[PDB]
Design a protein around this nucleic acid. Structure first.
Ligand code: NA
Ligand code: NA
Ligand SMILES: [Zn+2]
Ligand SMILES: [Zn+2]
Ligand SMILES: [Zn+2]
Ligand SMILES: [Zn+2]
Lengths: 162, 162
DNA sequence: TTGACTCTCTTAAGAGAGTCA
DNA sequence: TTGACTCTCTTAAGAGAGTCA
């Protein structure tokens, strides 16, 4: 809600509830042929999810609290960042999963960045493979690699140059 | 429907028309601190665009040819790939700008790959900075770099471990 | 047969808000 | 007040199809 105290109370309640989500260990590629281990705090697959939580889409949830007799609601991963600017360079700030695990609500696996920065982590080589993200990746992006391109650049005639 | 020869004729007419688009020389990052040059064949900003071409969205165009009284229409960047498989790994193939310049229709600046592979090139370090795309990038992706993350992973209490 | 417009849709990273009990 | 559902929207890489003369 409006007050900094009220916002801290929301973050604290959220952390306590998410802290009771099941902790699932995931071993992950780091880049450079190395492997690491992440501990994701995963929201349940079906109701009940936890106090304050409800599912609004297949992999979307919201956190809600009643403050001043009014319901306040947020995207379930946005709560850690309620005291941060909600935009950057004129782009909306989004909750970004460093663990690439949507059900995970561990705030140690989340950052707050533009949607472009968020998306780009999918292809990052990882913290041991050349990640240059200033807020470092926790793992190599799941889509990193050579790709599966069907056809490359080509022309039939002689009208084009690179 | 259209025979191999007829498809080849569509590709040839498309190349003839695109080859007459304004050719714009762009200096671009290659990765590794090096700069290179790309020559983009840019569709005009407003009508007329060229024989067979029409705008269906702010940066979307289509190519149309009428063969034996039947109107055929394709996305304007898909024409170079009409003789290629249109899916791979159960994913639709998309025209992917190696030059990251949507108005460009140079077929030497296009490849044909899944939408995920396509998007991922936005963050590639480039052909001189570590690109691992099997069909190599022509330049460093425009979104490569440290990012502009507003807030990193953090907790207020001690409920979580990474 | 052609040009110049019109409309909505896909994907996978993300969102806000209303209906009931 | 709290829970469990429902709906549509945003973005930026991409698409197909209709109308009129
Ligand atoms: Na993400
Ligand atoms: Na692209
Ligand atoms: Zn996680
Ligand atoms: Zn990274
Ligand atoms: Zn180009
Ligand atoms: Zn590349």
């Amino acid at each position: 809600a409006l007050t900094n105290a009220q916002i801290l109370a929301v973050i604290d309640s959220w952390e306590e509830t998410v802290g009771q989500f099941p902790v699932i260990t995931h071993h992950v590629p780091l880049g450079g042929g190395l492997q690491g281990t992440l501990h994701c705090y995963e929201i349940p697959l079906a109701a009940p999810y936890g106090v304050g939580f409800a599912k609004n889409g297949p992999t979307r949830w919201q956190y809600k609290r009643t403050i001043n007799q009014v319901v306040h609601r947020w995207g379930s991963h946005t709560v850690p960042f309620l005291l941060e600017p909600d935009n950057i360079n004129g782009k909306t700030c989004t909750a970004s999963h460093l663990c690439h695990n949507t059900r995970c609500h561990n705030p140690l696996h989340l950052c707050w960045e533009s949607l472009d920065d968020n998306k780009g982590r999918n292809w990052c080589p990882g913290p041991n493979g050349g990640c240059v993200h200033a807020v470092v990746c926790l793992r190599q992006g799941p889509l990193y690699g050579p790709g599966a391109t069907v056809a490359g650049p080509q022309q039939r005639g002689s009208h084009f140059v690179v």
